[PDB]
């Protein structure tokens, strides 16, 4: 009777964030796969402004934007170990890195599998620099959240599911460039929340050609 | 001791947010005008990732990104009413609208004063549609924050200082399109925090031609 619905699209690293946050809080939810090429009434009713997934619907009330949903989850299901720190400065730094990930990672990553030529190579270069900036922030910590798996980890880890695809389509190795970020990603995939929520990496690889066709990309 | 330094640029609607938040809290701060064409060592040290103003420096600790700074300010210093609601759902709605403003308003507004031709006319049209969306959200409420002036009001009000400029350089009338949004803006500029923080609309108009030259825009 506390009802939680998640409107989502399986390979979305953004939706993965809200799957993971929910699993971390042990919240039971109803996952509803959406067709973004034939948008459903419920998606169009719940996110009228942007018409995007994920949408988290809690007792009929929609919360849009994946990072906003992580924070809402953290506040509504509070725990001994919070996803966001209570210290205001440390909270602001977590928000900063979430904002950074939203601004930077996807746009460069998309040029790896979804473009060709000069644009593609410039996208690969920028994507690696962005990862190195994140790897420098992580430093020698277990998680971006320090000893605890937190907001920034959740913000980034959905992208990890696509790393095999980025390596394949960009003919390069992320482990060679960012070994510590790889070690971090392996650690996070050992968590139940993450292992449950991320699709298989090969499934993503298999889907890229179909996805390219659906997005009008000819490669 | 408590030291609050704000690295800023006078006509920035992003920096205006942080000025207004600090004034709502009655905080004593040191405002430090920055030359974005000859960036200072402090700006570069305090915002190494983006190298952008505003930067809020609290006892030597920097906080980057204007909306993040409003939230930090709200958590750190007391006021009669908070800038963000304590209800998680309302808080998430406020975040939603702040994110919407950051994603949409500037990119269209920039085409009004900073472009010519088809691009300019399309920018004016999109800017109007964005304002109408915002005006529908506001509805018949006194503030976006309902009865209390808050986060969303602060997120948008800096752009109000530029409306006379947008109408002049776009040869159009926002009041004709969005009268309730104009009423809102007039109401907010009566708040002492806002009146102290916004430049004179005329000072902005007088600056546009210089600003165009500095940005390499020929009009
Ligand atoms: N900030 C929101 C972002 C949520 C979001 O983007 N949701 C979309 C699906 S997540 S898969 C990544 C996405 N891809 C698409 O949107 C595919 C279709 C789109 N037409 C495209 O060409 O990319 C993406 O990030 N794309 C790039 C871009 O946005 O510039 C979604 O629901 N899309 C529906 C749509 O019609 O676009 C959050 O964090 O929640
Ligand atoms: N999200 C941050 C945004 C803070 C930010 O953009 N700060 C810049 C000053 S605010 S004035 C509007 C700004 N204009 C510029 O950046 C001028 C120079 C720029 N090179 C340009 O041509 O636009 C803006 O919004 N520009 C549009 C854009 O950035 O896409 C700032 O410090 N700029 C420094 C710079 O070198 O760019 C927040 O909310 O705080």
């Amino acid at each position: 009777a506390d009802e939680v619905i998640l409107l989502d699209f399986w390979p979305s690293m953004f939706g993965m964030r809200t799957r993971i946050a929910l699993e971390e809080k042990n919240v039971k939810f109803d996952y509803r796969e959406q067709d973004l090429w034939n948008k459903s009434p419920i998606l169009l009713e719940m996110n009228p402004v942007h018409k995007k997934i994920p949408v988290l619907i809690h007792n009929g009330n929609p919360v849009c934007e994946s990072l906003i949903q992580i924070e809402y989850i953290d506040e509504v299901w509070p725990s001994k170990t919070p996803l966001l720190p209570s210290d205001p400065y440390q909270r602001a730094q977590a928000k900063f890195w979430g904002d950074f990930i939203d601004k930077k990672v996807y746009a460069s990553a998309r040029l790896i599998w979804g473009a060709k030529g000069e644009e593609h190579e410039a996208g690969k270069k920028e994507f690696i620099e962005i990862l190195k900036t994140l790897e420098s922030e992580l430093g020698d910590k277990t998680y971006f959240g320090g000893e605890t798996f937190g907001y920034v980890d959740i913000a980034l880890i959905g992208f990890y599911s696509w790393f095999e695809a980025y390596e394949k389509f960009g003919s390069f190795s992320i482990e060679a460039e960012c070994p510590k970020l790889i070690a971090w990603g392996k650690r996070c995939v050992e968590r139940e929340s993450v292992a449950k929520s991320l699709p298989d990496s090969e499934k993503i690889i298999k889907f890229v050609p179909e996805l390219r066709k659906k997005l009008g990309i000819e490669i």
Side-chain angles (χ1 to χ4, degrees), chain A residues 9 11-15 17 36-37 39 43 50-54 64-67 69 102 106 110 211 215:
Chain A
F9 173 43
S12 175
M13 60 283 292
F14 301 112
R17 300 165 168 180
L36 298 176
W37 290 267
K39 293 185 181 171
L43 172 59
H50 298 304
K51 304 174 191 347
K52 288 181 197 311
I53 64 81
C64 298
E65 299 291 311
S66 59
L67 291 180
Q69 290 162 358
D102 277 2
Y106 185 89
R110 169 64 167 267
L211 180 60
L215 267 20

Side-chain angles (χ1 to χ4, degrees), chain A residues 38-57:
Chain A
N38 181 35
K39 293 185 181 171
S40 70
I42 193 166
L43 172 59
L44 297 172
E45 176 197 10
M46 293 298 101
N47 192 353
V49 174
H50 298 304
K51 304 174 191 347
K52 288 181 197 311
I53 64 81
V55 182
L56 180 74
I57 314 170

Side-chain angles (χ1 to χ4, degrees), chain A residues 56 58 63 67-77:
Chain A
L56 180 74
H58 185 205
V63 180
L67 291 180
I68 297 175
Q69 290 162 358
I70 300 173
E71 178 152 22
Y72 173 83
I73 294 158
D74 202 37
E75 287 166 9
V76 169
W77 293 268

Side-chain angles (χ1 to χ4, degrees), chain A residues 12-27 29:
Chain A
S12 175
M13 60 283 292
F14 301 112
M16 287 176 222
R17 300 165 168 180
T18 313
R19 298 170 222 176
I20 290 163
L22 292 167
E23 298 294 357
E24 284 291 315
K25 293 302 191 170
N26 279 17
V27 172
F29 66 99

